[PDB]
Design a protein around this ligand. Structure first.
Ligand code: MG
Ligand code: MG
Ligand code: MG
Ligand code: MG
Ligand code: MG
Ligand code: MG
Ligand code: MG
Ligand code: MG
Ligand code: MG
Ligand code: MG
Ligand code: MG
Ligand code: MG
Ligand code: MG
Ligand code: MG
Ligand code: MG
Ligand code: MG
Ligand code: MG
Ligand code: MG
Ligand code: MG
Ligand code: MG
Ligand code: MG
Ligand code: MG
Ligand code: MG
Ligand code: MG
Ligand code: MG
Ligand code: MG
Ligand code: MG
Ligand code: MG
Ligand code: MG
Ligand code: MG
Ligand code: MG
Ligand code: MG
Ligand code: MG
Ligand code: MG
Ligand code: MG
Ligand code: MG
Ligand code: MG
Ligand code: MG
Ligand code: MG
Ligand code: MG
Ligand code: MG
Ligand code: MG
Ligand code: MG
Ligand code: MG
Ligand code: MG
Ligand code: MG
Ligand code: MG
Ligand code: MG
Ligand code: MG
Ligand code: MG
Ligand code: MG
Ligand code: MG
Ligand code: MG
Ligand code: MG
Ligand code: MG
Ligand code: MG
Ligand code: MG
Ligand code: MG
Ligand code: MG
Ligand code: MG
Ligand code: MG
Ligand code: MG
Ligand code: MG
Ligand code: MG
Ligand code: MG
Ligand code: MG
Ligand code: MG
Ligand code: MG
Ligand code: MG
Ligand code: MG
Ligand code: MG
Ligand code: MG
Ligand code: MG
Ligand code: MG
Ligand code: MG
Ligand code: MG
Ligand code: MG
Ligand code: MG
Ligand code: MG
Ligand code: MG
Ligand code: MG
Ligand code: MG
Ligand code: MG
Ligand code: MG
Ligand code: MG
Ligand code: MG
Ligand code: MG
Ligand code: MG
Ligand code: MG
Ligand code: MG
Ligand code: MG
Ligand code: MG
Ligand code: MG
Ligand code: MG
Ligand code: MG
Ligand code: MG
Ligand code: MG
Ligand code: MG
Ligand code: MG
Ligand code: MG
Ligand code: MG
Ligand code: MG
Ligand code: MG
Ligand code: MG
Ligand code: MG
Ligand code: MG
Ligand code: MG
Ligand code: MG
Ligand code: MG
Ligand code: MG
Ligand code: MG
Ligand code: MG
Ligand code: MG
Ligand code: MG
Ligand code: MG
Ligand code: MG
Ligand code: MG
Ligand code: MG
Ligand code: MG
Ligand code: MG
Ligand code: MG
Ligand code: MG
Ligand code: MG
Ligand code: MG
Ligand code: MG
Ligand code: MG
Ligand code: MG
Ligand code: MG
Ligand code: MG
Ligand code: MG
Ligand code: MG
Ligand code: MG
Ligand code: MG
Ligand code: MG
Ligand code: MG
Ligand code: MG
Ligand code: MG
Ligand code: MG
Ligand code: MG
Ligand code: MG
Ligand code: MG
Ligand code: MG
Ligand code: MG
Ligand code: MG
Ligand code: MG
Ligand code: MG
Ligand code: MG
Ligand code: MG
Ligand code: MG
Ligand code: MG
Ligand code: MG
Ligand code: MG
Ligand code: MG
Ligand code: MG
Ligand code: MG
Ligand code: MG
Ligand code: MG
Ligand code: MG
Ligand code: MG
Ligand code: MG
Ligand code: MG
Ligand code: MG
Ligand code: MG
Ligand code: MG
Lengths: 67, 96
RNA sequence: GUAGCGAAAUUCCUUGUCGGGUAAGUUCCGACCUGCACGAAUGGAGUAACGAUUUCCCUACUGUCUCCACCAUGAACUCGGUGAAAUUGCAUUACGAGUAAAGAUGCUCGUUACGCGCAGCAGGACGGAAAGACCCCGGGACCUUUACUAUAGUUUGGUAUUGGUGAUUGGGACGGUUUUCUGAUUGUUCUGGUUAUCUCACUGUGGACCGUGAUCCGGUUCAAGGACAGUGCCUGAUGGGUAGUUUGACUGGGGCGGUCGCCUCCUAAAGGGUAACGGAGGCGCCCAAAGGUUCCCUCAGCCUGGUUGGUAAUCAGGUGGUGAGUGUAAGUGCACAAGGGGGCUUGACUGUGAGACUGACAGGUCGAGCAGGGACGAAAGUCGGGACUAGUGAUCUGACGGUGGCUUGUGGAUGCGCC
RNA sequence: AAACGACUGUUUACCAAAAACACAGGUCCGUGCGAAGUCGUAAGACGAUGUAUACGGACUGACUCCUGCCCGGUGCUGGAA
RNA sequence: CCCUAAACCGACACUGGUGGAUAGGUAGAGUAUACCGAGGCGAUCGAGUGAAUCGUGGUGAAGGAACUCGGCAAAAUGCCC
RNA sequence: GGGCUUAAGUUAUCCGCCGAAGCUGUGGCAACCUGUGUGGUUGGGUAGGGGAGCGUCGUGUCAGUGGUGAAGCUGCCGGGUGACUGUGUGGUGGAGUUGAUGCGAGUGAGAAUGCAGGCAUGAGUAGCGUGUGACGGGUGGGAAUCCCGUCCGCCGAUUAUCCAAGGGUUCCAGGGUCAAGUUUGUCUGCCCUGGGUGAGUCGGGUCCUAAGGCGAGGCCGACAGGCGUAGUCGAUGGGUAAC
RNA sequence: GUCCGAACCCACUUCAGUUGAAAAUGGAGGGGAUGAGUUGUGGAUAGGGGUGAAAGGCCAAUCAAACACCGUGAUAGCUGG
RNA sequence: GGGGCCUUGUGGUUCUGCUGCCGCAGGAUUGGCCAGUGAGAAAUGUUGCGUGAAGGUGAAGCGUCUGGGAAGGCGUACCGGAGUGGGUGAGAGUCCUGUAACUGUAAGCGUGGCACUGGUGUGGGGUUGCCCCGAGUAGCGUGGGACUCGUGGAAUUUCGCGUGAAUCUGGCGGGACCACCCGUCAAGCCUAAAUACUCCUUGGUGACCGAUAGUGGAUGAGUACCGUGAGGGAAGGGUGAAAAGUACCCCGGGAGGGGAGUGAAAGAGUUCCUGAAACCGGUCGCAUGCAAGCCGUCAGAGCCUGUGUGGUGAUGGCGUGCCUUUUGAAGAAUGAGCCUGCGAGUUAGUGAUGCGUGGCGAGGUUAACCCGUGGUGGGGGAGUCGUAGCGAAAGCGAGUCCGAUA
RNA sequence: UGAAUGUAUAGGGGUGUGGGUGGUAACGCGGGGAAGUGAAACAUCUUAGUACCCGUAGGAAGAGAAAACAAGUGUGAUUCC
């Protein structure tokens, strides 16, 4: 049978043109008042995963190209 | 992950949405057009770019990375501004 | 906490104390009350009779014993027949003092010992038999309850079954008395609450009759109820009656106690890092100034003089470099002040981030330069909160504001996305 | 002679026969009969071919003398501004 | 045909369990017990041998619970008038 | 440990030797690096990673081979760095199977208190299930254990006799001694063959009902089903004619 | 629901057995033995249920939820191989 | 849309009543386009085909050699629309059974199809005044279920309980809802084929098993046996080509053996092919009764043998099992009495992701299915991956996104 | 024929007209409907509408001739791949 892809991984991770795995930075959904604009700038970007985490995400995606 | 909140839970969900009616433009470049129609392709068409390679039964947008030293009449579905500018500079045209 | 009872089937201390019994009595039985922690239908205190119940004593009686002996028998033992069992890494399987996974037939150093049988005894082979029940850890089961979430049942009201006619009580329709109105209303319709009636709805019932010569059942009828009850659906309450489950870890075993994230110091062995239920403390804030900027100032202590006034309030002179101070722990800092004061302000900005620091990662931290638009300063310039480092919470889901990217035939709407 | 249970009985087949259970007696609560209670989805049935001197539940446990104070908590019963 | 069993229930040709009927004599209250009757059996490995020891019985000087957690077991008592 | 001071004790110092799978010499194997004439470095190893193989079975193809003896089994003589092996040589055996090269695996066992069978160990050991047998004669290949007889002992509210339940041919006669019988056995409740059970009255049915079961219709229940009327069964009882 | 005591029913003590004669018995005593007695035959109650003079006892020789089959090759961060 | 209202049209008529002495309908052998045993508003005899169940025919070899036996060897011929097998005393194309090919089928309830009989039967155009078009239904509310959708922005669909419509200028659907547009006409019914399956029947097949395997079952197998019952549930295959199964004699009561016969073989004698290991013995060689032994190993005398290598081994040195699990085990931690057999990394996906290798290459590749009853081959490009990325997306595009066209 | 009873029905008496009963390996349709398991606990969810069960077929069944899709043209019953 076909292998299903992981739903959370589908919704959370992207794969770039060069095979890099990127996610959205965590920690900016709420409780933003005490955070400086510098902290929000650090948390508003797009993070590139480490090699091990990227391999795990690629295993979780059943060939799904990411969101 | 051993009980630690796993990456696929700690990372925030990329939100957004998908366009239900999004169409994807098969793209051909001026490098490829020049290479596959070197003898000054007079009137290239969707069928001609398909017999070369455009993956037919799709819209056949033409993009403009290249030089296009020849004169060519593209007759395709949509084109980029730089591609159009290069085409009229070389002396060709686009249609549709 | 009464009557009564009490070192008791209850008394920890405890062999309480006294008295009886014995030559000697932690037991006994009668008392004391100092009841750790009696007590009146989970009955209190008694009680003739009863007890293969528990306890103490006397007598009789005895191999229970001093202290065993002897006799006969079923096994044991020899011969003939028949003929298992658990167990089993191995074998030509000594002792001593050692050594080693800390208890050796098997290793070391020594000592002793001819080969093989038979009857015996149980010190060892950590002997055999049962993948320890005790303990802990994982799972399960059943039990309990004011654990959680449900549920049968019981119960509430609505509504359907469900109709007829009334009164007695509230809200309008509605005009046309009042006085559209603070206040009164009536009639003409409409709609709630409550309540009493009526009866080929219904009740599964009391009598009679018939199916039938049947204590079932049904039908007819009478009586009694009666739109109630019953039942369906919806709904609130109740519900260990029942069901599924949860009930953390660390820990010099576990339990109890304590602890769990963040910050500072020491341990920490002069980079960084470094554990213990190691040694000390803090944090879950605060401040519209205690932020920004610009200019100005120097403290604490000590000595002397001085109304109230004293060690110490305010004042003067002298001395005094950090020992004062710092919103808040501690350290590193800060007198060039980052400490004290005045002026003007909102940078406690928007768009950014070269380049680095630090973590397994999520992440945490610093940051030049630039644009916009400001504050302060004559300018140089400084300003993306606070001398620095704690004052915090990923994701999910939902919410508000803005934006308008998307919207399933189109236009809206609605929903979503983005910030 | 003391403790316990009044007694005869009953009980852990296969480690406990007892001071445990039962018991006669006692009290409280429920039940007006299609009873309450119980089995069952229901019809039915037991209760009972019984009718409050009965039936069901609870605790106590022959007999003698007795059974005190507390309704704040919880439960039950009644009441409904 | 077996049938208070070698034939049934116990895996056995198993010192266990299995309902009913008949059931004489003497001693005796007796269907207890002893020895016998009607009738039936000698039991399904034997032969020996004074070992220790274990089981099962027997007797015991003087003492008489000194035993032991405890008079456990045994002994004594026992019937009729 | 023996023993040692007459050091074989301590200490300073000198001269020798012993001593490892270390080093060196010699011979073989292997991995890697290197310019590729040389040479250099390396080769303990659990978990584990990489590489290259042995053996078994099936199978495509080619070459074959086999009663002048395949497979299997079992000796001897050999071979390889290993799993293993000989195209050496016998024995047993009686119908298949070898080499090359591919292909496919139910492809390798010493452990799982593993499963099945066979067989050891304990061991000629414990036991042979309450007891009283003795003798004379007989039978027989064989007799404590079979038959007959005589003594003796045992049971006798049962070790007797007859039923029910249950069993099912064990009953009788004759033949038998592999197995079974806790020994032996000529014997048997065993084996083999044949035979044996006679009812108007006995015990049941043809008669009766109890508890209880089933239950025409029926009532109840989503279905499945529950209950129950009329009935109809059901002895452990009633009724019923022989000694 | 008297007394002593056989049958009968029981199971208090002790010894033996404990690879037993026996997966609970045997020897010696012991309790009840006209009663809430005991026993034969047939029947009824069934597994979250039965029944229980109540021990969580018993329900076909292991019952804090029987047995058989099925879901099923349940699952096991554990032990073994 | 239909009914109605009309302008016409019914198969050529014997020539009946009614509507108007117009027309309508019954009528009757006869055409007849047709249509038929089907779901089709229906269902009743005679004639044309190859066959299934049984059968029939079915080609073509001898001679020598060794052997118990020829299918083997050697020589030499034949058949083949037949060389697929399986038998026969060993390995057969021509010995047997068959096979190829052809043929028969009477019969079937036969069956399938055809002809005949026989049975059944037209519309087109206009019109809209009117009439009809499936009701406790659709909807709505509520409590549940199914839809990717787990109550939600909740369409569509469904059950219980309430409530309850329009009906053509109408109803429903197009994911709340409304409008328009597009589609469609629910609340009546029947419908072959492609699809699923095998207790059975017939034929065939297997890099499937070969008696601990394969069914539990190659045999009295759901049997023996166990359980009250539901239920559980085995083990045991092989003489030889042919019984020619050992006449007769001897020891023995027999059992068993010894002679002899049968047979190629009897050490193939029925417990019978082959006959391994554990295990149990006889014989021979050496060692062993002064010795402390994880049982071996290295050194090594003597003896035996010499089939000149082998067997044995006095005596000396060194030396604490295997596995598991462990910081650490000879361990007095676990498991194993012994041998033989059996017993654990598999398989399936046009799964995911690497690598090796082969093909093709800016292209690669098919899936279902169709053809090949002749297979493993050919077709099939629907799809799918590569061919452009960036963005939540509109979109833009070698750029894009955040941003101010920074 | 017609009860109570008036209509009449229930019922009763004929007649025998037709059908039913039960079995069956898989496949079908309609309905009822687990748990172990997974989620490293667990309750939503999962397992799974699976196991099992009830009713009921046929040689196949079910479905089926648009109150359908589509999205601007169009497709034209259902089933299956
Ligand atoms: Mg947000
Ligand atoms: Mg902010
Ligand atoms: Mg956590
Ligand atoms: Mg005292
Ligand atoms: Mg005390
Ligand atoms: Mg005293
Ligand atoms: Mg009181
Ligand atoms: Mg009280
Ligand atoms: Mg008390
Ligand atoms: Mg009392
Ligand atoms: Mg008292
Ligand atoms: Mg008393
Ligand atoms: Mg007693
Ligand atoms: Mg005395
Ligand atoms: Mg003896
Ligand atoms: Mg002997
Ligand atoms: Mg030590
Ligand atoms: Mg020692
Ligand atoms: Mg030693
Ligand atoms: Mg040794
Ligand atoms: Mg000995
Ligand atoms: Mg001995
Ligand atoms: Mg010992
Ligand atoms: Mg032990
Ligand atoms: Mg134990
Ligand atoms: Mg254990
Ligand atoms: Mg246990
Ligand atoms: Mg639990
Ligand atoms: Mg249990
Ligand atoms: Mg109600
Ligand atoms: Mg109501
Ligand atoms: Mg009234
Ligand atoms: Mg009335
Ligand atoms: Mg009235
Ligand atoms: Mg409870
Ligand atoms: Mg509970
Ligand atoms: Mg669970
Ligand atoms: Mg835990
Ligand atoms: Mg502790
Ligand atoms: Mg712990
Ligand atoms: Mg440091
Ligand atoms: Mg350091
Ligand atoms: Mg550390
Ligand atoms: Mg300052
Ligand atoms: Mg702020
Ligand atoms: Mg940077
Ligand atoms: Mg920090
Ligand atoms: Mg600026
Ligand atoms: Mg200025
Ligand atoms: Mg500050
Ligand atoms: Mg400041
Ligand atoms: Mg979550
Ligand atoms: Mg659409
Ligand atoms: Mg922003
Ligand atoms: Mg007293
Ligand atoms: Mg006392
Ligand atoms: Mg008593
Ligand atoms: Mg009493
Ligand atoms: Mg008593
Ligand atoms: Mg009893
Ligand atoms: Mg007992
Ligand atoms: Mg009473
Ligand atoms: Mg009632
Ligand atoms: Mg009654
Ligand atoms: Mg009491
Ligand atoms: Mg009160
Ligand atoms: Mg009170
Ligand atoms: Mg109240
Ligand atoms: Mg008898
Ligand atoms: Mg017996
Ligand atoms: Mg028997
Ligand atoms: Mg007498
Ligand atoms: Mg007697
Ligand atoms: Mg006699
Ligand atoms: Mg007899
Ligand atoms: Mg016997
Ligand atoms: Mg002797
Ligand atoms: Mg005596
Ligand atoms: Mg004497
Ligand atoms: Mg004496
Ligand atoms: Mg005397
Ligand atoms: Mg005396
Ligand atoms: Mg004493
Ligand atoms: Mg003493
Ligand atoms: Mg005594
Ligand atoms: Mg005595
Ligand atoms: Mg050396
Ligand atoms: Mg070396
Ligand atoms: Mg060397
Ligand atoms: Mg190596
Ligand atoms: Mg080395
Ligand atoms: Mg390894
Ligand atoms: Mg040959
Ligand atoms: Mg072979
Ligand atoms: Mg090969
Ligand atoms: Mg294998
Ligand atoms: Mg083996
Ligand atoms: Mg075995
Ligand atoms: Mg032996
Ligand atoms: Mg002997
Ligand atoms: Mg012995
Ligand atoms: Mg002996
Ligand atoms: Mg003996
Ligand atoms: Mg005897
Ligand atoms: Mg005898
Ligand atoms: Mg005799
Ligand atoms: Mg006698
Ligand atoms: Mg007598
Ligand atoms: Mg008979
Ligand atoms: Mg016979
Ligand atoms: Mg027999
Ligand atoms: Mg006989
Ligand atoms: Mg014998
Ligand atoms: Mg005989
Ligand atoms: Mg005989
Ligand atoms: Mg009769
Ligand atoms: Mg009856
Ligand atoms: Mg019926
Ligand atoms: Mg009768
Ligand atoms: Mg009868
Ligand atoms: Mg009495
Ligand atoms: Mg009896
Ligand atoms: Mg006892
Ligand atoms: Mg004992
Ligand atoms: Mg008495
Ligand atoms: Mg019964
Ligand atoms: Mg208890
Ligand atoms: Mg039992
Ligand atoms: Mg349970
Ligand atoms: Mg499952
Ligand atoms: Mg498992
Ligand atoms: Mg273990
Ligand atoms: Mg022929
Ligand atoms: Mg030939
Ligand atoms: Mg319609
Ligand atoms: Mg709708
Ligand atoms: Mg709804
Ligand atoms: Mg759903
Ligand atoms: Mg709806
Ligand atoms: Mg729409
Ligand atoms: Mg249909
Ligand atoms: Mg088999
Ligand atoms: Mg074999
Ligand atoms: Mg076998
Ligand atoms: Mg049976
Ligand atoms: Mg031959
Ligand atoms: Mg042979
Ligand atoms: Mg054999
Ligand atoms: Mg053989
Ligand atoms: Mg010697
Ligand atoms: Mg030694
Ligand atoms: Mg350890
Ligand atoms: Mg060991
Ligand atoms: Mg050992
Ligand atoms: Mg262990
Ligand atoms: Mg072991
Ligand atoms: Mg084994
Ligand atoms: Mg395409
Ligand atoms: Mg049928
Ligand atoms: Mg669950
Ligand atoms: Mg779970
Ligand atoms: Mg788990
Ligand atoms: Mg159909
Ligand atoms: Mg059509």
């Amino acid at each position: 049978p076909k292998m299903k892809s992981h739903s959370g991984t589908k919704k959370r991770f992207k794969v770039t043109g060069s095979g890099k795995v990127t996610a959205r930075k965590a920690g900016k959904r709420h409780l933003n008042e005490h955070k400086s604009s510098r902290v929000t700038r650090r948390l508003t970007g797009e993070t590139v995963l480490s090699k091990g985490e990227a391999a795990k995400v690629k295993k979780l995606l059943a060939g799904h190209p990411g969101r | 992950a051993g009980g630690q909140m796993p990456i696929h839970m700690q990372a925030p969900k990329l939100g957004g949405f998908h366009n239900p009616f999004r169409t994807e433009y098969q793209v051909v470049n001026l490098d490829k057009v020049e290479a596959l129609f070197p003898k000054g392709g007079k009137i290239t068409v969707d069928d001609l770019v398909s017999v070369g390679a455009v993956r037919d039964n799709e819209l056949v947008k033409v993009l403009g990375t290249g030089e296009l030293t020849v004169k060519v009449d593209l007759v395709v579905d949509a084109w980029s501004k730089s591609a159009q500018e290069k085409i009229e500079k070389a002396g060709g045209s686009v249609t549709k």
